[PDB]
Amino acid sequence: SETQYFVSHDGNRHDLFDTLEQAEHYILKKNGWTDGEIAEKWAFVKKEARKYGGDPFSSNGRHSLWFITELKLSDGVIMEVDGQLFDDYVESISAERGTEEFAETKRRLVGYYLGW
C-alpha cells in the first residue's frame, strides 16, 4: 500500500509525485517562486492560507485552479481518493456500481489519474 499525490491544474493532469512536498514544490516552481522564496516563505504562506480559507497556491489573490489529490494504491490499483474509497467516490459523482454510468466514470478517472 502506497500513497501518491496527483497534481492537476484547471482539470488538466500534471504528474504523480511520491510525496506532498514534491507536489507542492512543483506547483510553486510552476507559479514562478524562486527556490529562495520557497524555503523562506512557503511554510508560513501555507499555514496562513490554511488558517483563513485561502488558496496557498494563489498567484494573484484568488483560487489558482491547482489541486493536489491524495491517491492510495495497491499494485497500481487506486483504492482511495483523498481518504475516500474509490468506488464510493465514483458513485457520488455518477451512479451506483453495476450501471454503465459507473463503469464509464471510473474508467475515465482511472485513465486520467494514471496518465493513459
The answer to whether 81 touches 73, Cβ cutoff 8 Å, is no
Taking the complex as a whole, how short is the minimal distance between the CB of residue 92 and ligand [N+], in angstroms?
A: 14
* Residue 13 sits in the site that holds ligand [N+] (CB under 6 A): yes
* Residue 79 sits in the site that holds ligand [N+] (CB under 6 A): yes
In whole angstroms, how far apart are CA 73 and each of 83, 95, 107?
A: 11, 23, 16
Identify the three-state secondary structure at position 82. coil
* Residue 82 sits in the site that holds ligand [N+] (CB under 6 A): no
* Residue 56 sits in the site that holds ligand [N+] (CB under 6 A): yes
In whole angstroms, how far apart are CA 116 and each of 13, 18, 103?
A: 11, 18, 16
* Residue 95 sits in the site that holds ligand [N+] (CB under 6 A): no
Question: Considering only residues 37, 84, 97, 108, which one is a binding residue for ligand [N+] as defined by CB under 6 A?
Answer: 97
Taking the complex as a whole, how short is the minimal distance between the CB of residue 13 and ligand [N+], in angstroms?
A: 3
Q: Please list, in sequence order, all residues whose beta carbon lies within 8 angstroms of the beta carbon of residue 9, skipping any fewer than 6 positions away.
A: 30, 64, 65, 66, 67
Strand partners, 74: 77
* Residue 86 sits in the site that holds ligand [N+] (CB under 6 A): yes
Residues that bind ligand [N+] (CB under 6 A): 9, 12-13, 21-22, 25, 30, 44, 48-50, 52, 54, 56, 77-79, 86-87, 97-98
